[PDB]
């Protein structure tokens, strides 16, 4: 039981870190490029 609980606990922190990190991922604006209007919106949504 100890082996599974510990491995899950380190695993969880690794994902928890990756999660908060992705949250900090800032949106980019190709506002200067007229042809990349769809690209920017698609990127933003994703």
């Amino acid at each position: 039981m100890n082996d599974g609980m510990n491995a899950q606990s380190s695993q969880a922190l690794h994902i928890q870190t990756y999660c908060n990190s992705v949250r900090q991922q800032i949106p980019v604006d190709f506002g200067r490029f007229p042809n990349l209007r769809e690209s920017e919106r698609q990127i933003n949504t994703g």
Binding site: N20, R23, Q24, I26
Partner: protein, 52 residues
């Protein structure tokens, strides 16, 4: 025991409330850090163009 149980339940609810507060704080900080990074990149781009 029942009295103690009831008190613990209230305390549990209070704990969940504090967690929610923390969650909001986390989101607020995350948003701040993200906006900061965005400004940094925007600035980095300006000086990296200006130096051509």
């Amino acid at each position: 025991l029942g009295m103690v149980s009831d008190k613990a339940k209230e305390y549990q609810e209070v704990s969940a409330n504090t967690r929610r507060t923390i969650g909001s704080l986390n989101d607020k900080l995350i948003i701040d850090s993200n906006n900061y990074q965005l400004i940094v990149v925007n600035l980095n781009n300006v000086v990296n163009g200006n130096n051509g």
